[PDB]
Amino acid sequence: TSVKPIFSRDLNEAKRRVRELYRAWYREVPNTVHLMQLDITVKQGRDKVREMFMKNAHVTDPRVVDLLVIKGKMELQETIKVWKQRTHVMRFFHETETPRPKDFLSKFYMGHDP
Amino acid sequence: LGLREIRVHLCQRSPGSQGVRDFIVQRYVELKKAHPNLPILIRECSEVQPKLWARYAFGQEKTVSLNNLSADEVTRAMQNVLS
């Protein structure tokens, strides 16, 4: 309560920015896959864009959302230009890490993790 | 199906626990004599809503919320669990 705003009067207004940033990515996946020779197809590239958004769909603070949008635009600027190469873009897909299990019994078999 | 052990929670000084604490000093002595092999695992905490947890044959726990129930009102509440 009683916290100054940052580019957001209320959550709904900040949701428009997120929807503006999503339209910037969806229009951009088909240009990165070609401009830098990625091994993915555009259909599955847009899926990862959507996935990276549902990762942060539970937030409700207007200030936090604006900072998330600000970072996303920076993440988009480094991709609109080829500042970040194939090594960085393919880092989101996690094509090497072993899928960490969820079942307690599988966790119990390997490691001391909770 | 068949009751295996009861356990009761209550506070020391909380007014809500009144009736559970008045219950023990009158009716606890009689009951344990009536059911020698039925552990009534009464436990006394600091701040907690009084409860009457009951344990049955297989994995099964039925509980009540006997908060602000008079001393006699607890007598019927637990007598229900026995029968």
Partner: protein, 207 residues
């Protein structure tokens, strides 16, 4: 006499102390807790909303020609609710004096930029953001300057582990440099070196 203890030129303590008060009553709306240290260096604490008026004043005013921005650092202090204490070191080249200006911030309380006043801030101004996550208003470019293009983090925050959360290695399965969670071969050995005795009684904090 005392070859070990530093010579103390007390003249420059009076001059700074007079100027700190002069700045205090010529800009009351923002100035908080001006102070002068043993080492004769002035220190002015400013409400974050007054960064532009204070920095613009201390540059243009005839009696305070602080035109050179030495640096724009940031100290993380998790103890205080407003963690990030942005620091501005300034230099005069006219009166041959250095003045520090301090404001507080927070991971959700950005601060107005200064590139309008001091263009030197521009790169320093991102360095704070890249290292501390202190968003700055009205900056032109405002992107990461130091960290990799894919750090989802802010390294200099005290809550960031020293080794980091990710390591880079080369993989033939994918024929490119990949990122995996860090598994150090020898864990960093944190040395508990603090002595249990009051080294400095002049800074005692009663309970």
């Amino acid at each position: 006499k005392r070859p070990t203890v530093r010579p103390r030129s007390d003249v420059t303590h009076k001059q700074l102390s007079a100027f700190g008060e002069y700045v205090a009553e010529i800009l009351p709306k923002y100035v908080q807790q001006v102070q002068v240290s043993c080492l004769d260096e002035l220190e002015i604490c400013i409400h974050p909303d007054g960064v532009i008026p204070t920095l613009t004043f201390l540059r243009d005013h005839t009696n305070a020609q602080f035109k050179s921005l030495a640096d724009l650092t940031a100290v993380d202090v998790p103890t205080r609710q407003n963690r990030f204490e942005i620091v501005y070191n300034l230099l005069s080249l006219r009166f041959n004096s250095r003045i520090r200006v301090k404001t507080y911030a927070d991971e959700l309380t950005p601060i107005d930029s200064i590139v309008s006043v001091h263009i030197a801030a521009n790169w320093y101004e991102r360095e704070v953001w890249d290292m501390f996550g202190v968003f700055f208003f009205n900056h032109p470019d405002l992107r990461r300057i130091l960290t990799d293009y894919g750090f989802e983090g802010h390294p200099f925050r005290k809550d960031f582990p020293l080794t980091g959360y990710v390591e880079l290695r080369y993989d033939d399965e994918v024929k490119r440099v990949v990122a995996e969670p860090v598994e150090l071969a020898q864990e960093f050995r944190k040395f508990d070196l603090n002595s249990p005795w009051e080294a400095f009684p002049a800074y005692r904090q009663p309970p």
